[PDB]
Design a binder for this molecule. Structure first.
Ligand SMILES: CC(=O)O[C@H]1[C@H]2[C@H]([C@@H]3[C@@H](O)[C@@H]4[C@H]([C@H](C)C[C@]5(O)OC(=O)[C@@](C)(O)[C@]45C)[C@@]3(C)[C@H]1OC(C)=O)[C@@H](O)C(=O)[C@H]1C[C@@H]3O[C@@H]3[C@H](OC(C)=O)[C@]21C
Ligand SMILES: Nc1nc2c(ncn2[C@@H]2O[C@H](COP(=O)(O)CP(=O)(O)OP(=O)(O)O)[C@@H](O)[C@H]2O)c(=O)[nH]1
Ligand SMILES: Nc1nc2c(ncn2[C@@H]2O[C@H](COP(=O)(O)OP(=O)(O)OP(=O)(O)O)[C@@H](O)[C@H]2O)c(=O)[nH]1
Ligand SMILES: Nc1nc2c(ncn2[C@@H]2O[C@H](COP(=O)(O)OP(=O)(O)OP(=O)(O)O)[C@@H](O)[C@H]2O)c(=O)[nH]1
Ligand SMILES: [Mg+2]
Ligand SMILES: [Mg+2]
Lengths: 428, 426, 428
């Protein structure tokens, strides 16, 4: 009755969407053939006789990553005119993904978005998974968001962006892409949650006792976060939220829309036997800085808004008791102009466990979305690296040979300076 | 029409109050669940002094239980006759006193006394017209002394025109059970000279001596001593609950016993206490009860009653007896040994007779004495105090909680004033 | 509803804790699986469905002692986050435990103490097990006691310390560590019970008729004493104490808090068949010098405070008769400023027997604690040893190369002279 269209662009989007759709087809008992041997209408569409096609569009510029989805275990599932592919990749070059390569695929993917948005009645918003450092995951994401904000007006539009780690890095033309993308998407998205690779590496080392995690464990954790967001829409609870609540509750001014996400409890199968995981314990474990999924410290800033999403066997009285005993501690400090700084949601259906994974079975689980002023410090680091690679005009000719003049870098630097000034203003 | 509420504070007061409610509920004829199953009619017409009617002929006591650790509360609740009390009357803390007077009066009692006084005020609002209160405690520890003292003072500033008894066991001459015992005794007596109407003095050693020389027991527990204390309490207040030929309630004993308002420290006793072997070798006559009352080795406090003189004596007899025999024998035992009685008071003895005996006895008697030789007890506290107060030993545990040395010198001067008033009249 | 947290530091504290938790699991019926087929609440925390985990923290700087606990038959008992280790031992160097190596651990063990003490509601105090003659058992104990007295304020903090013997010694630099840790811990501990190795060797030689005792027999006796101290909390008795009363009865002046402990009756199964063990017999027999578990002469000093803890089938009348006939004898003499010098506690539950052990089945048991002026002489011996190794500056460079000046040794010897003058002052 109320629906959502999920778009995955780029390699990071395709792999996070692989883990997410595996989790979704496991939660509602659906086989990879599409048949289940009714709430799933918020994500699926019934095709004739016991066949469910999902509402997903997978788009990419390189035909190597999608053609492993078309021959994996989910060959039967997605519709063949939804997995759109290009011919040549962006080559970590935002000028290729915005101007030259991306503009022969955008009309076809917008026709598929228009066709999937006519099979609904109560369309609530889109969900776009993408990275920051990559080529198509920045340029094609910003072009897609610009066209969606022109065409679809005042509907919701959330995001999932991969935040670049401070010390750990793969590319070298990365902060160019980050500053250009954050300048261009600053006027079209509605909210955008952040996750960092290095914090999830440290989490899987310290908590889950995994010494060598590959990308499957990281994508499983990201999928757990998206599942905890949308499980207030897929089931019924005592105190429930939907997708148009978050933009009203977490974004005070229309350019501060980067909250960071946290999950709890993340423990192994061994240390779960020796622990009682009540609501006060997991509420306190959400708030200690060794468990954040972005490598920054909330002690170096003040909270502007906090939103908790609970699942399982929780009663609201000790939820209120736990938030009460959180609000007295001095370790945690909230901002002055916001005395009511919480938004509470409680759902009934517990989280399930994907077999072959690394998580254990728990009854209760929390997902936190926090909008804090610590993330300004992270912006500082990225800004500084830009200046170094703009001090000597390094790698600029690759971008200016593909349809971008030199002043765009100055514009992006000025807008990131303005954003750091806005954060400093509302914080200090 | 005259009702009494009961407050028990400490460990020792909790045990004695538990055995007291077992004895009283056996005497009036109700089950451990609170249902009435008596065989007489006189067991229910004057039941309002201790119990409340509740919703289908169940009667609950008018008792209030307070302690600073939940151990004795849960131990009293789990045992027999534990389902009688109302569960809102169990008030307790979490911390514990540590046998500091100061930690009971100043540190934890200040947080517990609000809830205790709210329950006392509600039970006092529910009653018609009360006679007074009573409290059971010990003068050797921290919960009993400190918080019983605090509750006594608050109740006197709220209810100043009632009679407030205390049944308090005191420190023993030869062997102690706490190292900081005379500190607690001196400060608690410094408050109880002022703020109470009468106080009954019990020893643990004299109870062991009655249990060895007269009762001829081989293995006595604490249950037998708390039964002895409860027998004396019920014998004191029996004239309120049953009709008698010559009767006397609490205020009558107040008016008769204390000549000057600071000399309200008595020594009680019970009779007859016999063995199982020599039970069938004696009679049941009033001369045997009277000679067993006025006897040195029967007193429940370790003070030799022939070391001074008697001020006033009260005697509460129970059973069906003859008053010519009673009064002739009080005359006989008063002119027999006249040196042990005050010269400027004629006919020292006060007499009362109630009809219905204890459960299983043909006849019984209760003795209450107000004598001068209790000064000996007070002497042996104060000198002990001065020994430690000549060296400031163990003092910093008290001084860290909010007291000064001037309070200790104040309390020593108060207790020596009391020994001076006791030596005045002999 | 009222609890205790026990911390074990160093090898001697870890092994005494091994025997203590073996005995505490044997008493309450809990298997080494942590499942029994509610008094144990004061030591164990219930975890979900029939699992009771202990309230203990094990910490050492060397990983060869905790690993045997992590592999031995109590593998399933403790929480695996509560067994903390390092990488390099203190090497009998007090400066390596207090200053250099011991500071990479203390934030972790303080976090574990804070995370265990938030699950309590009636927390009554701590119990720290350690020796004197070693490196981490003195240095880490002193630094941990500093942090606990700063953080946790007015709660009672007890210790169980192995006192160094007159003749029997293992290390060569023992009196240095003893003087330094006695200077440092004198301002944060509330009561520290002293036990000796040589007196337990003589008790096992003469009473038990064991001619070659290992460390296991000594740790069984120490576990019996600590169990008898805490049985007033784990059970229900006629005249019962708790953990806060001991300091108020045994500590007159705030720097004389070194009492010595004793247990009775310790016999074999061969002499147990030929004697009735009355309460008067064990009360007179705990007051003889050949049973005192510190190698000293109680006849050469006068008593200041005594505390007797009875367990089993005792009645109070002959308890008071036995104390009365103690105070009539001439050799057992008390001090002048204390006429009342006994504190009595009586419990109901008898002492349990460990299988394969060495103690006999008995119904009555006495624990004695004594605060006396004999131990001043023992202090004097230690100071004399210090003086000789301070006449030539032997072994000092190992200390001063790790972060300790040459002023601390003169300071600590000054405070030992002050404490000797204090004992002689209150004695004479
Ligand atoms: C002296 C005597 O026989 O009294 C017994 C009690 C009875 C005591 C009984 O309760 C015994 C007590 C024992 C001496 C001790 C006892 O085992 O421990 C307790 O807690 C007691 C006091 O309740 C126990 C269970 C007993 C045997 C005795 O209580 C004592 C000695 O304090 C008591 O139950 C009665 O019913 C009394 C009724 C008649 O008055 C007599 C007797 O009491 C007296 C002092 O006169 C009783 C038969
Ligand atoms: N007649 C009784 N006397 C008792 C009993 N238990 C203890 N005592 C006496 O109490 C004294 C020991 O301390 P107290 O109990 O008086 C002090 P209390 O325990 O009430 O306070 P806390 O320090 O808060 O525990 C000592 O004189 C004992 O003889 C009992 O059951 N009966
Ligand atoms: N958390 C997570 N991060 C990934 C994953 N795959 C790639 N990344 C990160 O994505 C960034 C690289 O940019 P990509 O998104 O891979 O580039 P692209 O989308 O494939 O587009 P092209 O430039 O055409 O290759 C790096 O920071 C990677 O660490 C993944 O599976 N999980
Ligand atoms: N009763 C008993 N005494 C022990 C034991 N182990 C060592 N001791 C004594 O402790 C002293 C030796 O110093 P240790 O306590 O072993 O030093 P440590 O605590 O291991 O610290 P490190 O120097 O880091 O190894 C000697 O006096 C030993 O008699 C034991 O298991 N039981
Ligand atoms: Mg690619
Ligand atoms: Mg070692």
């Amino acid at each position: 009755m109320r629906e959502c269209i999920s778009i995955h662009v780029g390699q990071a989007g395709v792999q996070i969407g692989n883990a997410c759709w595996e989790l979704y087809c496991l939660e509602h008992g659906i086989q990879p053939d599409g048949q289940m041997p009714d709430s799933f209408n918020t994500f699926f569409s019934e095709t004739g006789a016991g066949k469910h096609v999902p509402r997903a569009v997978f788009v990419d510029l390189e035909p190597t990553v999608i053609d492993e989805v078309r021959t994996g275990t989910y060959r039967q599932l997605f519709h063949p005119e939804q997995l759109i592919t290009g011919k040549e990749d962006a080559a970590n070059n935002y000028a290729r993904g915005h101007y030259t390569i991306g503009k022969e695929i955008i009309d076809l993917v917008l026709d598929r978005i228009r066709k999937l948005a006519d099979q609904c009645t109560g369309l609530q918003g889109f969900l776009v998974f993408h990275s920051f450092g990559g080529g198509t995951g920045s340029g094609f994401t910003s072009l897609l968001m610009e066209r969606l904000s022109v065409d679809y007006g005042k509907k919701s539009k959330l995001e999932f962006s991969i935040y670049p780690a401070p010390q750990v890095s793969t590319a070298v033309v990365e902060p160019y892409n980050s500053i250009l993308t954050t300048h261009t998407t600053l006027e079209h998205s509605d909210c955008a949650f952040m996750v960092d690779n290095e914090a999830i590496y440290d989490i899987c080392r310290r908590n889950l006792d995994i010494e060598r995690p590959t990308y499957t464990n990281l994508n499983r954790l990201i999928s757990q976060i998206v599942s905890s967001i949308t499980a207030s829409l897929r089931f019924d609870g005592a105190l429930n939220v939907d997708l148009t609540e978050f933009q009203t509750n977490l974004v005070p001014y229309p350019r501060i829309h980067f909250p960071l996400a946290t999950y709890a409890p993340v423990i192994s199968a061994e240390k779960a036997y020796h622990e009682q995981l009540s609501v006060a314990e997991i509420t306190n474990a959400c708030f200690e800085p060794a468990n954040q999924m972005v490598k920054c410290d909330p002690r170096h800033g003040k909270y502007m808004a906090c939103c908790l999403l609970y699942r399982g066997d929780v009663v609201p009285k000790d939820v209120n008791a736990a938030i009460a005993t959180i609000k007295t501690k001095r370790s945690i400090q909230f901002v002055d102009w916001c005395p009511t700084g919480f938004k509470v949601g409680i759902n009934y259906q517990p989280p399930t466990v994907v077999p072959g994974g690394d998580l254990a079975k728990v009854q209760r689980a929390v997902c936190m979305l926090s909008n804090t002023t610590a993330i300004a410090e992270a912006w500082a680091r990225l800004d500084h690296k830009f200046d170094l690679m703009y001090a000597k005009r390094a790698f600029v000719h690759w971008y200016v040979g593909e349809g971008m003049e030199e002043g765009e870098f100055s514009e992006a630097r000025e807008d990131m300076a303005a954003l750091e000034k806005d954060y400093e203003e509302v914080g200090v | 029409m005259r009702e009494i509420v009961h407050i028990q504070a400490g460990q020792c007061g909790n045990q004695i109050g538990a055995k007291f409610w077992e004895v009283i509920s056996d005497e009036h004829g109700i089950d451990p669940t609170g249902s009435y199953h008596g065989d007489s009619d006189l067991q229910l017409e004057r039941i309002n002094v201790y119990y409340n009617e509740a919703a289908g002929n169940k009667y609950v006591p008018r008792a209030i239980l307070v302690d600073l650790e939940p151990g004795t509360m849960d131990s009293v609740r789990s045992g027999p006759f534990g389902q009688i009390f109302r569960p809102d009357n169990f008030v307790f803390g979490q911390s514990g006193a540590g046998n500091n007077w100061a930690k009971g009066h100043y540190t934890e009692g200040a947080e517990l006394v609000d809830s205790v006084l709210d329950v006392v005020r509600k039970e006092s609002e529910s009653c018609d017209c009360l006679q007074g209160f009573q409290l059971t405690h010990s003068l050797g520890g921290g919960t009993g002394s400190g918080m019983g003292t605090l509750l006594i003072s608050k109740i006197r500033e709220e209810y100043p025109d009632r009679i407030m008894n205390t049944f308090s066991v005191v420190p023993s001459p030869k062997v102690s059970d706490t190292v900081v015992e005379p500190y607690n005794a001196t400060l608690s007596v410094h408050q109880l000279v002022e703020n109470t109407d009468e106080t009954y003095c019990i020893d643990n050693e004299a109870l062991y001596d009655i249990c060895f020389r007269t009762l001829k027991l081989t293995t006595p527990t604490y249950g037998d001593l708390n039964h002895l204390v409860s027998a004396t309490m019920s014998g004191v207040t029996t004239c309120l609950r049953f009709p008698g030929q010559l009767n006397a309630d609490l205020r009558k004993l107040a008016v008769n016993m204390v000549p000057f308002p600071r000399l309200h420290f008595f020594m009680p006793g019970f009779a007859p206490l016999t063995s199982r072997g020599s039970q069938q070798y004696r009679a049941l006559t009033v001369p045997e009860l009277t000679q067993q009352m006025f006897d040195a080795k029967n007193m429940m406090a370790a003070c030799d009653p022939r070391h001074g003189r008697y001020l006033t004596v009260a005697a509460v007899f129970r059973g069906r007896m003859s008053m010519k025999e009673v009064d002739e024998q009080m005359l006989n035992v008063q002119n027999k040994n006249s040196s042990y009685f005050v010269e400027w008071i004629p006919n020292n003895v006060k007499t009362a007779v109630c009809d219905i005996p204890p459960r299983g006895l043909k006849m019984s008697a209760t003795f209450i004495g107000n004598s001068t030789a209790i000064q000996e007890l007070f002497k042996r506290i104060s000198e002990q105090f001065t020994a430690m107060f000549r060296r400031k030993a163990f003092l910093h545990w008290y001084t860290g909680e909010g007291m000064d040395e001037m309070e200790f010198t104040e309390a020593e001067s108060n207790m020596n004033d009391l020994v001076s008033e006791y030596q005045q009249y002999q």
